[PDB]
């Protein structure tokens, strides 16, 4: 209804898993015209959860030195990319993104301190909040690394990162590092 970037009404999208049903923030309550807000979401634990996930992706898309404060360039490339995925798939870009978030969120991980077999020792499953947080970072990094020494731009690099994550073709760096994690976690049970 809110017509994010003038279009793509947020009332149509859905989250296919209930572990993430209340941990994604594209609901009509979190329906915002623009993904820019100095709302002070991160001043408290369990408060970035209600931050709109489109806002969170926008914040997480700026990294590596020259781009840490620049947010207008990020929101504009986010806008360019969302029209790109809407064009390349034909459906709602938030649905492209939400499928990317769910399919790229690493369901389990492993973390220990002492002497380890290969990398880690004991397998510990992650939280749904960690599922969303890691999926956002992994999608952002995949776009970031794909646009370093090629003629392609950030918006298109983010487009294939979201798309290959949403469908699943082991071309998204967000799912490729996810499965590389799932292998080690299962083997280190």
């Amino acid at each position: 209804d809110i017509k994010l970037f003038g279009k793509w009404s947020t009332d149509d999208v859905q989250i296919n898993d209930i572990s993430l049903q209340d941990y994604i923030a594209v609901k009509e309550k979190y329906a915002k015209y623009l993904p820019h807000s100095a709302g002070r979401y991160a001043a408290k634990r369990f408060r970035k959860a209600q931050c709109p996930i489109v806002e969170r992706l926008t914040n997480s898309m700026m990294m590596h030195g020259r781009n840490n404060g620049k947010k207008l360039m990020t929101v504009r490339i986010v806008k360019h990319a969302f029209e790109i995925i809407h064009l390349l798939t034909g459906e709602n870009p938030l649905q492209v993104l939400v499928n990317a978030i769910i399919n790229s969120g690493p369901r389990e991980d492993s973390t220990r301190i002492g002497r380890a077999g290969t990398v880690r020792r004991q397998a510990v499953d992650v939280s749904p909040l960690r599922r969303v947080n890691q999926a956002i970072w992994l999608l952002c990094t995949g776009a970031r690394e794909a646009a370093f020494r090629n003629i392609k731009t950030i918006a298109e690099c983010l487009a294939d990162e979201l798309i290959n994550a949403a469908k699943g073709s082991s071309n998204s760096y967000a799912i490729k590092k996810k499965d590389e994690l799932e292998r080690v976690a299962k083997s280190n049970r």
Partner: peptide, 14 residues
């Protein structure tokens, strides 16, 4: 000047 953020200016009136 910030045409990118103009929808924040349109946000109250809308």
């Amino acid at each position: 000047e910030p045409r990118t953020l103009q929808y924040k200016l349109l946000e109250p009136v809308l």
